[PDB]
Coordinates of C-alpha atoms and ligand atoms in Angstrom, one line a residue:
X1 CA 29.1 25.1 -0.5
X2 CA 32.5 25.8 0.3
X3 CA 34.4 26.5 4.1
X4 CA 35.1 29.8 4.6
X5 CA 39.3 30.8 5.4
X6 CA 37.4 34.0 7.1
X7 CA 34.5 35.4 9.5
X8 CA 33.6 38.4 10.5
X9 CA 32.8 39.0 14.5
X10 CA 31.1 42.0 15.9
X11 CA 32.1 42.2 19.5
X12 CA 29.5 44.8 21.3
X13 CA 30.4 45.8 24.7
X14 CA 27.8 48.2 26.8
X15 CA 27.1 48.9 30.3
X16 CA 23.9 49.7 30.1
X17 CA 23.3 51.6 34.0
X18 CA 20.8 49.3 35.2
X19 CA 18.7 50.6 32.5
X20 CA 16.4 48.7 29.6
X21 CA 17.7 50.3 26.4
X22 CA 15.7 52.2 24.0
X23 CA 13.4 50.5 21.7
X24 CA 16.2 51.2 18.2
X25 CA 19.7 50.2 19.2
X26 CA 20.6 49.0 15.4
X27 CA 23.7 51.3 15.2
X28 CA 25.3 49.5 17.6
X29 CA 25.5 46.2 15.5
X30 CA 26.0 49.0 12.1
X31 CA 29.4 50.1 13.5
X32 CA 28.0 53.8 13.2
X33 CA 28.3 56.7 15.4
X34 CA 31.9 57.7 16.6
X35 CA 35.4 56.0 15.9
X36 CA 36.3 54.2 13.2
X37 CA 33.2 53.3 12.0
X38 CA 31.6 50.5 9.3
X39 CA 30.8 51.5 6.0
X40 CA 27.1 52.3 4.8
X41 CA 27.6 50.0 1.9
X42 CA 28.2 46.9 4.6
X43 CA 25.1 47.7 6.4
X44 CA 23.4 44.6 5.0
X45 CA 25.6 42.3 5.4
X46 CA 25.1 40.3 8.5
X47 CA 28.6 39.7 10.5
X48 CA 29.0 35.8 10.8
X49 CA 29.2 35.9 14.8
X50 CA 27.8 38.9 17.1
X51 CA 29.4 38.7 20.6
X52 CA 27.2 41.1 22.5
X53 CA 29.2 42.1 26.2
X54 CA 26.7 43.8 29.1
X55 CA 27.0 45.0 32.1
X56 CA 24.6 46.6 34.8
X57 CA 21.7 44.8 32.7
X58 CA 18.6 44.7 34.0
X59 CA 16.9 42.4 31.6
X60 CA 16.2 38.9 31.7
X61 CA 18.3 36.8 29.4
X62 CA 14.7 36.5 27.3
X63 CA 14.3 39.7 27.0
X64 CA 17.6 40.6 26.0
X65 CA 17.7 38.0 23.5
X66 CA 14.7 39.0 22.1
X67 CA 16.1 42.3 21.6
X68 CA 18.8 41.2 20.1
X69 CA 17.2 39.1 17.6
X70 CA 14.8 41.2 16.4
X71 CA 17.2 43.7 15.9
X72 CA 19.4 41.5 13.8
X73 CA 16.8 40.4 11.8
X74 CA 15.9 43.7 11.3
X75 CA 19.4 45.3 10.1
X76 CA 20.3 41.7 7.9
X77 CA 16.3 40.3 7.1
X78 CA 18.7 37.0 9.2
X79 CA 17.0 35.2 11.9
X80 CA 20.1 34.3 14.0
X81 CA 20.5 31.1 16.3
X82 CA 21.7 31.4 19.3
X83 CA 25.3 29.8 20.6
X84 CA 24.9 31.0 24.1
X85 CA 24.0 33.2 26.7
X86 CA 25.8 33.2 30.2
X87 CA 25.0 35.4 33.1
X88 CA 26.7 36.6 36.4
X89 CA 24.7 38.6 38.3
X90 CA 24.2 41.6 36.1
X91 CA 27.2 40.6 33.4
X92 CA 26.2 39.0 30.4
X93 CA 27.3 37.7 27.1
X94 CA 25.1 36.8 24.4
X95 CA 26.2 34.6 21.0
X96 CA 24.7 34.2 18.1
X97 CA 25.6 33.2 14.7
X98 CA 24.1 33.2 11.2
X99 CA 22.2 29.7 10.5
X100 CA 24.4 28.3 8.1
X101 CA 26.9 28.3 11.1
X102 CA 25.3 25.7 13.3
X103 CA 27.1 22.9 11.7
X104 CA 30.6 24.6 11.9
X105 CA 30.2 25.6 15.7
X106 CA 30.4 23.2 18.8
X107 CA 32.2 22.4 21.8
X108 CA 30.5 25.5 23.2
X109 CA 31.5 26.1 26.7
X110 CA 30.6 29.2 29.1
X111 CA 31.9 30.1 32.2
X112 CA 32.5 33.0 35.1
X113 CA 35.0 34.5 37.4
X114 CA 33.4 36.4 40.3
X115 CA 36.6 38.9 41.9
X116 CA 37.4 40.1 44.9
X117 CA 36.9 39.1 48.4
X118 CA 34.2 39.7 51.5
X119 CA 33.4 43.7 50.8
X120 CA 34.2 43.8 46.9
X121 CA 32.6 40.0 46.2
X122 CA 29.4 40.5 44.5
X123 CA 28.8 42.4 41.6
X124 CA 32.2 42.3 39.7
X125 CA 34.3 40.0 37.4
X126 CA 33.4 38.0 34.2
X127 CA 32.1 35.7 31.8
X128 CA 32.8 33.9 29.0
X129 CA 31.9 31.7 26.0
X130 CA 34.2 29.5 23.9
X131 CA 33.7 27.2 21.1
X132 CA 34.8 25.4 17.4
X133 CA 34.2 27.4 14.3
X134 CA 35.3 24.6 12.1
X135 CA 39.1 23.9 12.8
X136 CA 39.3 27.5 14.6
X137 CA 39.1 28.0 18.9
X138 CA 37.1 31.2 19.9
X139 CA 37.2 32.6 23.0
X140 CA 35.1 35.5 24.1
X141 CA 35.7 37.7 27.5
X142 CA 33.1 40.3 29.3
X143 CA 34.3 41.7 31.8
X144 CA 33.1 44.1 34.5
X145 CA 36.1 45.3 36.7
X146 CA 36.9 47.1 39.5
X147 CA 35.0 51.0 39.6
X148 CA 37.1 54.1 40.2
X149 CA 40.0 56.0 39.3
X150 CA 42.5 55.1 42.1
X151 CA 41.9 51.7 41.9
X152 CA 43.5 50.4 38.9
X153 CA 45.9 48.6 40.5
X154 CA 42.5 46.2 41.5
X155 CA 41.5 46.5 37.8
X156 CA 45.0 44.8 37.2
X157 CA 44.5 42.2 40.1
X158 CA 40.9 41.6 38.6
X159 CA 42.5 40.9 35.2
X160 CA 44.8 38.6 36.2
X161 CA 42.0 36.6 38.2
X162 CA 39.7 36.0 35.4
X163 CA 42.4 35.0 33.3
X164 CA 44.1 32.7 35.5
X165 CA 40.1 31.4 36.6
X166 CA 38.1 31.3 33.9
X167 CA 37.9 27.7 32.5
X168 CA 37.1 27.8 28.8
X169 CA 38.5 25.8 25.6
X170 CA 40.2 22.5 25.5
X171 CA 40.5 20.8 29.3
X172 CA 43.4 19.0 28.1
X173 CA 45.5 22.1 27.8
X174 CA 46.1 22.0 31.3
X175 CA 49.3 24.0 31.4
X176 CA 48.1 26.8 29.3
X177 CA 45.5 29.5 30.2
X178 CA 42.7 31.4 28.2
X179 CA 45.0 34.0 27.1
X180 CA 46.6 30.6 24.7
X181 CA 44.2 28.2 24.7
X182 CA 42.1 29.9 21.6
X183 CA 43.5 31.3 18.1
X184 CA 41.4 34.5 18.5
X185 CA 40.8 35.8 22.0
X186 CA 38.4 39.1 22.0
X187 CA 38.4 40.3 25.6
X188 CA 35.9 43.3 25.9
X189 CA 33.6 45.1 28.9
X190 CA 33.6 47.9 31.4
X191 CA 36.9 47.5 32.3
X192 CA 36.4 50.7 34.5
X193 CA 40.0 52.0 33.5
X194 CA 40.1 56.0 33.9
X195 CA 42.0 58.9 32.5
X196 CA 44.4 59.8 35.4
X197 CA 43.9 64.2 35.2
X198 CA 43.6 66.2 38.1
X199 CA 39.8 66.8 39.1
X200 CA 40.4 70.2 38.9
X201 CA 40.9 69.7 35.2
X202 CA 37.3 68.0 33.8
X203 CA 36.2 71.4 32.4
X204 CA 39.6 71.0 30.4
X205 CA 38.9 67.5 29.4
X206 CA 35.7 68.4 28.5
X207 CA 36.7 71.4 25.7
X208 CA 39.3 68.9 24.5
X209 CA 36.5 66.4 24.1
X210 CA 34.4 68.6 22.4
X211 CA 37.1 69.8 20.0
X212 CA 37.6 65.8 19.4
X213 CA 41.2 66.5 20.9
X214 CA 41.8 63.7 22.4
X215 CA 45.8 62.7 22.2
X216 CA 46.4 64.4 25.5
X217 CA 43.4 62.2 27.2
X218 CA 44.8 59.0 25.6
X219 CA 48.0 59.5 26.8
X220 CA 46.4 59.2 30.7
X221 CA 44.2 56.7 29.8
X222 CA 45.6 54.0 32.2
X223 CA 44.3 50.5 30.2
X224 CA 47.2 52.2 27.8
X225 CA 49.7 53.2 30.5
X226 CA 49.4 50.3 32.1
X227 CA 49.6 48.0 29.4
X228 CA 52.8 50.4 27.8
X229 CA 54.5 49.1 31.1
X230 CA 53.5 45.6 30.8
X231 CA 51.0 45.3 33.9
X232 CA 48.1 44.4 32.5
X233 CA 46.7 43.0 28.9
X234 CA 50.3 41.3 28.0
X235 CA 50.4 40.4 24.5
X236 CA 46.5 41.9 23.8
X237 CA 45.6 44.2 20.7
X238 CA 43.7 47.2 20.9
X239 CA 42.5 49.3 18.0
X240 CA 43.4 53.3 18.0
X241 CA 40.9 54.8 20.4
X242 CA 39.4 57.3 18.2
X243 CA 35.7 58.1 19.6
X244 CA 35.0 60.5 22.7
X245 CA 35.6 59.0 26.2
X246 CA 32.2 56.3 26.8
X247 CA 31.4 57.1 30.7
X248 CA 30.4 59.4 32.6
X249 CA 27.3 60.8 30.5
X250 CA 24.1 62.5 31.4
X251 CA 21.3 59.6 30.7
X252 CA 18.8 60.6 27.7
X253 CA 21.3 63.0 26.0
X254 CA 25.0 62.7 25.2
X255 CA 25.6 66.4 25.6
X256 CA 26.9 66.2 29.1
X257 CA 29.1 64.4 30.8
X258 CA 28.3 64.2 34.5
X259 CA 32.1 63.9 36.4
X260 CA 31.2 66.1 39.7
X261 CA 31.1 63.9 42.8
X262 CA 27.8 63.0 44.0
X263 CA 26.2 60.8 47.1
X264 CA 25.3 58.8 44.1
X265 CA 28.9 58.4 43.3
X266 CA 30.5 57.4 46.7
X267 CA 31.3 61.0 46.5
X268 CA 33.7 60.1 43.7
X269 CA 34.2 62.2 41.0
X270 CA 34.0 60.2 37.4
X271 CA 36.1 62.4 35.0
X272 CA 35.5 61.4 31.3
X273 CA 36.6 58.3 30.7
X274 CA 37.4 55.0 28.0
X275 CA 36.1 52.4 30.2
X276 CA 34.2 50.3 27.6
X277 CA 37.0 48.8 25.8
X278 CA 38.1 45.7 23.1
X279 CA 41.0 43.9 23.1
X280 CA 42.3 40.4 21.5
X281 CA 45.1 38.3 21.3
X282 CA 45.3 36.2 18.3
X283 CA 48.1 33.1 17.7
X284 CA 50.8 34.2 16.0
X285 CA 50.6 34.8 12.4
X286 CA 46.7 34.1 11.9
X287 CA 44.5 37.2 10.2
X288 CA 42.9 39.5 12.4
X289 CA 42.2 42.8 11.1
X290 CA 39.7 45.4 13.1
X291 CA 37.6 46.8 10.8
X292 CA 35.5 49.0 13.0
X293 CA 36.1 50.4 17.1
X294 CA 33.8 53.2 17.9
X295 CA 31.0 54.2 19.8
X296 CA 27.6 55.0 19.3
X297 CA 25.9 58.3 19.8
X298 CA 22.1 57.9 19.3
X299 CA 21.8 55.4 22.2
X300 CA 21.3 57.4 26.1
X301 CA 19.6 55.3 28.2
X302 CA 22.6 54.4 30.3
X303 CA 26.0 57.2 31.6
X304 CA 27.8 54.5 29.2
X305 CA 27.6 54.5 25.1
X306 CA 27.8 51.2 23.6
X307 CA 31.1 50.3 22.3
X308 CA 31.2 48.2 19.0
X309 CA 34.6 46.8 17.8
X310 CA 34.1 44.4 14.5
X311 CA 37.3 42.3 12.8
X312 CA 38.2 39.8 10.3
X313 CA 39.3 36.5 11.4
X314 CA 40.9 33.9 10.0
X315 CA 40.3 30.4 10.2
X316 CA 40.5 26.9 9.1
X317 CA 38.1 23.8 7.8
X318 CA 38.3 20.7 10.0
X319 CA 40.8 18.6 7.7
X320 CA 40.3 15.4 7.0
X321 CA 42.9 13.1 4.7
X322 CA 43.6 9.1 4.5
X323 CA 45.4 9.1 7.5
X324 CA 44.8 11.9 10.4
X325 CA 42.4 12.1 12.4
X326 CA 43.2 8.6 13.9
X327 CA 46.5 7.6 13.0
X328 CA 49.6 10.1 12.2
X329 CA 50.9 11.1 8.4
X330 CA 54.7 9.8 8.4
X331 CA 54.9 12.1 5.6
X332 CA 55.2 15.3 8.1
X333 CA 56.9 16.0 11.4
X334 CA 58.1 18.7 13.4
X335 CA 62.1 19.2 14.7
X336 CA 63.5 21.7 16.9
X337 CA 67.1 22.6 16.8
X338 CA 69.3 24.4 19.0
X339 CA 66.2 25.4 21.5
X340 CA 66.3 27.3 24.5
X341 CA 64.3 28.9 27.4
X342 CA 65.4 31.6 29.3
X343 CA 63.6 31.7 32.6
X344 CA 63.3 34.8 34.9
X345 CA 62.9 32.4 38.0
X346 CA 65.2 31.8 41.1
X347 CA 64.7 28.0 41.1
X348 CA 67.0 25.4 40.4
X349 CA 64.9 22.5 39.7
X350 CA 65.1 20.7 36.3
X351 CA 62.8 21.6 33.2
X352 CA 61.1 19.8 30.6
X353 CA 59.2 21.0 27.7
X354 CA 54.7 19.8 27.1
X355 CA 54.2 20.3 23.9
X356 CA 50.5 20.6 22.5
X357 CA 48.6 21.0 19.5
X358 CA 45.8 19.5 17.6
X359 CA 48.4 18.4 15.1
X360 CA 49.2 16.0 17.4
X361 CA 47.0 13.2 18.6
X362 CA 48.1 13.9 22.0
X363 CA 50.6 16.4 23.5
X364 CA 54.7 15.4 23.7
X365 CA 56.8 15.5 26.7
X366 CA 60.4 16.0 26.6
X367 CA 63.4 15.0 28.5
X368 CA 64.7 17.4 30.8
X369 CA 66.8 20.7 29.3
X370 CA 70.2 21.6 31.1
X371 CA 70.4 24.5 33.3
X372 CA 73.0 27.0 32.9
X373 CA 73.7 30.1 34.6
X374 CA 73.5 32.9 32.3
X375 CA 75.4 35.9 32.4
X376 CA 73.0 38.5 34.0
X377 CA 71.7 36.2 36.6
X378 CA 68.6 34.7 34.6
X379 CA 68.0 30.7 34.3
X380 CA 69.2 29.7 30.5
X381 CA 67.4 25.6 29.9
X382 CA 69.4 24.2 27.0
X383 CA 67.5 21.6 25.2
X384 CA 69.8 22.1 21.8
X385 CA 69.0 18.5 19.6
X386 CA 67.3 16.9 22.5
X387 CA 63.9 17.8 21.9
X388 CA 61.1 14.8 20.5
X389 CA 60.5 14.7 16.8
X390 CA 56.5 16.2 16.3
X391 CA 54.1 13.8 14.1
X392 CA 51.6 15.6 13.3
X393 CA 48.4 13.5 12.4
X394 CA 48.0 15.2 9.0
X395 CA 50.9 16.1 6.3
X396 CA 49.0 18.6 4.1
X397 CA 51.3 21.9 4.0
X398 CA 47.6 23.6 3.3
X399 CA 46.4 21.8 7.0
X400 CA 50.2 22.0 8.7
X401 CA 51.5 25.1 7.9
X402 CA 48.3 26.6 9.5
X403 CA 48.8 25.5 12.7
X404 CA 50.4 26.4 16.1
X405 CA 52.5 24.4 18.6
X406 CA 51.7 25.6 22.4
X407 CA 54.6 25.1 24.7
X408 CA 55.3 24.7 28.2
X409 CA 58.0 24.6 30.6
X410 CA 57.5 22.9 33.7
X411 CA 59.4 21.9 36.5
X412 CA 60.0 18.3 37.2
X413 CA 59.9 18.8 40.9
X414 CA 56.1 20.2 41.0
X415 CA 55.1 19.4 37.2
X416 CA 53.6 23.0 37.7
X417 CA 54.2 25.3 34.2
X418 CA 56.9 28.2 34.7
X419 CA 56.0 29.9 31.3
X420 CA 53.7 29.0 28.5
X421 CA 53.7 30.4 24.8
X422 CA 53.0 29.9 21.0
X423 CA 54.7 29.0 17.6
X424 CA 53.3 29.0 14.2
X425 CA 53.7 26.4 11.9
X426 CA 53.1 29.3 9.0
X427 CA 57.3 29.5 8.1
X428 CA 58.8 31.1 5.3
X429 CA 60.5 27.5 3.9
X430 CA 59.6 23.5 4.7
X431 CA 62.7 21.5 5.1
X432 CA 64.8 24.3 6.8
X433 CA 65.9 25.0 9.9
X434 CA 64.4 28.8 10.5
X435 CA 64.4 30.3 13.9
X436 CA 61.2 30.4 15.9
X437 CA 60.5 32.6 19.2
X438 CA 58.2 32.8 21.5
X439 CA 57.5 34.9 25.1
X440 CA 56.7 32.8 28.1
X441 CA 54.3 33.6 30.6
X442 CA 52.6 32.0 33.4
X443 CA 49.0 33.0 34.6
X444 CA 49.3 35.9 32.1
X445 CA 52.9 37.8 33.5
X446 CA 56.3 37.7 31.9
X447 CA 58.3 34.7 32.7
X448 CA 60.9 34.6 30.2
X449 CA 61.3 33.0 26.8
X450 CA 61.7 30.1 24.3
X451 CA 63.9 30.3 21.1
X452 CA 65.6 28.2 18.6
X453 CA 65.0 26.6 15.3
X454 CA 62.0 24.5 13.5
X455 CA 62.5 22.3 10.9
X456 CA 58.8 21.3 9.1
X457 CA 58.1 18.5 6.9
X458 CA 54.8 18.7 5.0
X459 CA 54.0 16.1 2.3
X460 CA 54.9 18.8 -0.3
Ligands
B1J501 O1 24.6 20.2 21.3 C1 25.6 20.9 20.6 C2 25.2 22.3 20.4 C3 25.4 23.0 19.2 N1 24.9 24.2 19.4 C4 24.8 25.3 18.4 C5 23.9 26.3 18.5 C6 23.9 27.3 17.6 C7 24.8 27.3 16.6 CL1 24.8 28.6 15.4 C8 25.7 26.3 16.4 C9 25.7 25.3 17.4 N2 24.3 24.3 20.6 N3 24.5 23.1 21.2
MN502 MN1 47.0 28.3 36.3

């Protein structure tokens, strides 16, 4: 029975209004209602993985699982295990995979972020499960952020906190944060971003709603402004938005959308809005393709429709030759030529590179770079022919050219990373130098960049 090279994830994400849901919520794990929706002709075929993303749940973790099960079951005639479950106060995520899975999945790890301080600790921020699929890293993101329209700069803040704070994946990737430490990232909840329109105009947003107009929405909608302008979600993936604003709706129909401020509000008003949303970052060069991001319609109990997002992934069998794991494959290894990183700090320490990946048996230091002042007053680290030689513990071009190389540059002062990023081992030649790129970031923000050339030796 062979590996699979792909999976198919269903990431659900719904704030269910402190509400227990309706006794049929099978179009949400169908893909049908609004959006880019799943074919009739898949609706039998179970998804390998459903990540299922809540907020404002009332139920216990039992009875939500149940729920869940039993609607699985009933959609794929699959009894699904369960991976994990993780709770912070009323945010959940929920796991589960087909059977056959159970022996392709482990180092399953969960974790939360609570945000804010004092006032605004206590209901908002995140969790999160990560774990193996064979030779893949998953990581998985729910989170609830900060409510209302003229806060998004505290939606931003939020972001950047659970990123930087929530401790999934490999502990030995110390310089490197969530948003590198797996090959598919699917971030996903209530982020509570709004469209920014006057008040006066929700009767407007309303008709254009209604006439499924909604170009003149997304271009207020401020997950995308803020994103367009780097200040949020760097480097993330978002499907076309192409289902009605999610929240605010009249509970038990989805006729009306109830915007007008209200005690019940914080005398806020809650113009139609996308804020139940799915994003992912995947490694460079690795298949990800979204094959469903919509919204269901038949589902009321809460002011929020479920959001469903579902996507092909890549991934990889856990290799095994002669050699690697255990010992290194002298037949391969990894070169960098004429490397550089471009650094959009003031500092003047020194720089060296970390260099991880588990094509390596451990990760690779490398002697300090040489600082030179670049033109427009940025921080240019030469490293040109200095940089280690990679042995990678497996020479296979089918294992090798699959894989990625995390970088960071730290500073040998502090030994504290200025920028991390990502190169793919999947190149257009083997035993040529071809040049490689990557962004740098640090605790999610721009930092600068890394550039050069690789030259890979595979057994072939
Ligand atoms: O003790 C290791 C471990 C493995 N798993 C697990 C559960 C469900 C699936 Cl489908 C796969 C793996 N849980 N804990
Ligand atoms: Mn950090």
């Amino acid at each position: 029975q062979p590996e699979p090279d792909m999976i198919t994830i269903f990431i659900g994400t719904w704030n269910m209004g402190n509400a227990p849901p309706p006794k049929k919520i099978t179009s949400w794990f169908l893909s049908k209602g609004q959006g880019k929706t799943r074919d009739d002709s898949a609706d039998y075929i179970p998804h390998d993985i459903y990540v299922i993303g809540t907020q404002e749940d009332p139920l216990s973790e039992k009875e939500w699982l149940e729920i869940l099960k039993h609607s699985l079951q009933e959609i794929t005639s699959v009894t699904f295990k369960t991976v994990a479950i993780h709770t912070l106060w009323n945010i959940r995520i929920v796991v589960l995979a087909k059977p056959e899975h159970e022996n392709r999945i482990s180092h399953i790890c969960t974790d939360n972020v609570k945000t804010g301080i004092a006032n605004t600790l206590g209901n908002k921020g995140a969790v999160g499960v990560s774990f193996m699929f064979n030779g893949t890293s998953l990581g998985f993101v729910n989170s609830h952020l900060t409510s209302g329209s003229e806060k998004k700069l505290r939606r931003n803040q939020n972001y950047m906190n659970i990123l930087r704070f929530l401790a999934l994946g490999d502990k030995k990737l110390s310089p490197f944060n969530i948003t590198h430490r797996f090959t598919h990232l699917f971030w996903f909840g209530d982020l509570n971003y709004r469209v920014d329109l006057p008040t006066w105009e929700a009767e407007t947003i309303i008709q254009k709603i209604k006439q499924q107009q909604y170009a003149d929405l997304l271009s207020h909608d401020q997950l995308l402004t803020e994103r367009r302008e780097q200040k949020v979600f760097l480097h993330f993936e978002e499907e076309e938005i192409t289902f009605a604003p999610t929240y605010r709706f009249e509970r038990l129909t989805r006729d009306k959308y109830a915007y007008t401020k209200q005690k019940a509000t914080g005398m806020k008003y809650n113009l139609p809005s996308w804020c139940d949303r799915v994003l992912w970052k995947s490694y460079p060069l690795v298949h990800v393709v979204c094959q469903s991001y919509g919204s269901t319609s038949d589902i009321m109990t809460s002011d929020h429709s479920p959001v469903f997002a579902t996507f092909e992934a890549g991934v990889t069998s856990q290799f095994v030759s002669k050699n690697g794991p255990g010992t290194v494959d002298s037949q391969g290894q990894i070169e960098f030529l004429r490397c550089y990183a471009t650094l959009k700090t003031k500092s003047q320490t020194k720089f060296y590179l970390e260099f991880h990946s588990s094509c390596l048996e451990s990760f690779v230091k490398s002697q300090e770079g040489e600082n030179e002042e670049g033109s427009e007053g940025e921080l240019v680290v030469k490293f040109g022919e200095t940089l280690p030689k990679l042995k990678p513990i497996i020479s296979d071009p089918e294992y090798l050219l699959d894989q990625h190389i995390l970088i960071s540059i730290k500073s040998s002062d502090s030994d504290e990373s200025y920028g991390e990023g990502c190169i793919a081992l999947r190149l257009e030649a083997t035993e040529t130098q071809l040049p490689i790129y990557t962004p740098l970031t640090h605790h999610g923000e721009l930092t600068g960049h890394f550039q050069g050339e690789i030259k890979l030796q595979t057994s072939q």
